[PDB]
Homo-oligomer: A and B are copies of this chain.
């Protein structure tokens, strides 16, 4: 046996695996159970801690992907398949992964903890693009990632009831974070230097742990990539959560609408997991893009108020946070329902298609609100140019769901004590399989942050390898010090503030400082549109 691959955590003994990386070996403990399997009677319930075990658990491969809808819009297309499960689906899914240097560090090492995205309906820590080995080998950090329940299994809510209280997927995340505090030192990690980071719903998840006191003592720094807890898609209210839960139950025969909550969830627990998934999308109130059926619910518990309110009302002194977006946040989403869009043509839509897409991309708002959107995103010297319309609907979707929620969070946290750093990621990967008109689409910075270009199996350019190493250094510098800058003759990355609103561009060129995260657009979404909706 190899003593470097054996570790004892509070629950018992573990055996890991040694991983080859271009720069040297790494130890990986993959598929560590951290909760009792949420099966049968435990479906929809908060996670229970894993009961201790005798003997040695083999933590030598990724465990199952949590039950979730699988994308089939472009079968066999790498651009969609890379986000799909690469392990069997199972409700027996609450495992986490730890990567550490080989040999194990001898002084406590800072810990990065990854929370994946996937719209709160999909995702997995086992995906090739979240491989932790390159980060750990390049920056000598400990990396942890966990699986958490998605879809109805993670976020179906009948608020008030003990049988389906909602938000158990976030409680899965919190339980893993408690696992890190109790156990990460056994791998050489420092429980007093834990940086959360995540993308899309993962980033909103990070933000929700910032705004929930019980999670706030489990980490020290945060990174929000292309997502924010105040996104119009990231939370739902109690009533609409109940309506969605109740319509899902109805669509699958429960009860034999509404009634006793206990009886209804009991009937839901008898349905095969895949049956729930097959009806997941049918509970949404209108045709939309960037909307997901089961998301965190604001019920006073995990979130005492809406994320907008807690952000505006919070003292964030002592917090360092790193936030950003990619260059074309909205493009990806348009091919999932906006009329006239396809990955397989230029998607040069008409004015009528643009106006129709406004209602898909900004669903469930008043006609007047839709008109305010058309006013701000129409160029009235070129109201019908197809190219300009394409990029405008992209900007509508990107600004409303990602950029302006990120901007609001960044500016409010900065003005209330937090040290904030902001980026716009502008490199389009040479390997990208989505069409040229989508630009740098949502999610396509991740592979660079994790250093996937260092994988010799893959076909990135040498400059992209240089660039991934640069980004890994920034992220790790932020995790160890709260500050991405290098402890010289390198251009500096200034804090983001509500007034100067400075951020840096991340691409193959050196850091370039710019001002304003779509400030004119985001004044519309963050300052004016809320007033319009209240009157």
Residues of chain A having any CB pair with chain B under 8 Å: 366, 368, 371-372, 375, 378-381, 501, 515-516, 519-520, 522-524, 527-528, 531-532, 535
Contacts and interface: CB of A to CB of B under 8 A. Distances in A.
9 contacts: A368-B532, A368-B535, A372-B372, A372-B532, A375-B524, A380-B520, A381-B501, A381-B515, A532-B532
Given A380-B516, A516-B380, A516-B381, A375 B535 contact: no
Nearest to A534: B368
A519 B368 contact: no
If over half of A's interface residues share one DSSP class (helix, strand or loop), that class is named, otherwise mixed; here it is: helix
Contacts of A380: 516, 519-520, 522-523
A531 B371 contact: yes
A372 B529 CA distance: 9
A515 B519 CA distance: 26
A190 to B, nearest CB: 40
Given A381-B516, A516-B381, A368 B531 contact: yes
Contacts of A528: 371-372, 375
Contact of A381 (B378, B381, B519): B519
Nearest to A384: B499
A492 B535 CA distance: 49
Given A368-B532, A368-B535, A375 B527 contact: yes
Nearest to A366: B535
Contacts of A523: 375, 378, 380
Contacts of A535: 366, 368
Contacts of A371: 528, 531
Nearest to A528: B375
Contacts of A372: 372, 528, 532
Most B-side CB within 10 Å, residue of A366, A380, A535: A380
Nearest to A527: B375
Closest 6 CB pairs of A and B: A380-B519, A375-B528, A380-B523, A368-B535, A381-B516, A381-B519
A375 B531 CA distance: 11
A520 B374 CA distance: 12
Contacts of A378: 523
A532 B376 CA distance: 14
Contacts of A527: 375
A354 to B, nearest CB: 15
A408 B368 CA distance: 21
Contacts of A501: 381
A532 to B, nearest CB: 6
Contacts of A381: 501, 515-516, 519-520
A79 to B, nearest CB: 35
A381 B499 CA distance: 8
Contacts of A368: 531-532, 535
A21 to B, nearest CB: 43
A383 to B, nearest CB: 9
Contacts of A531: 368, 371
Contacts of A375: 523-524, 527-528
A261 B298 CA distance: 62
A524 B515 CA distance: 26
Given A379-B520, A381-B519, 20 more contacts: A368-B531, A368-B532, A368-B535, A371-B531, A372-B372, A372-B528, A372-B532, A375-B523, A375-B524, A375-B527, A375-B528, A380-B516, A380-B519, A380-B520, A380-B522, A380-B523, A381-B515, A381-B516, A381-B520, A532-B532
Most B-side CB within 10 Å, residue of A372, A501, A515: A372
Contacts of A379: 520
A143 to B, nearest CB: 38
Contacts of A515: 381
A527 B371 CA distance: 9
A22 to B, nearest CB: 43
A430 B380 CA distance: 35
A201 to B, nearest CB: 28
Nearest to A523: B380
A532 B529 CA distance: 12
A535 B528 CA distance: 16
A4 B520 CA distance: 66
A468 to B, nearest CB: 32
Contacts of A516: 380-381
A226 to B, nearest CB: 22
A522 B528 CA distance: 18
A368 B375 CA distance: 16
A235 B229 CA distance: 49
A460 to B, nearest CB: 36
A141 B363 CA distance: 61
Contacts of A519: 380-381
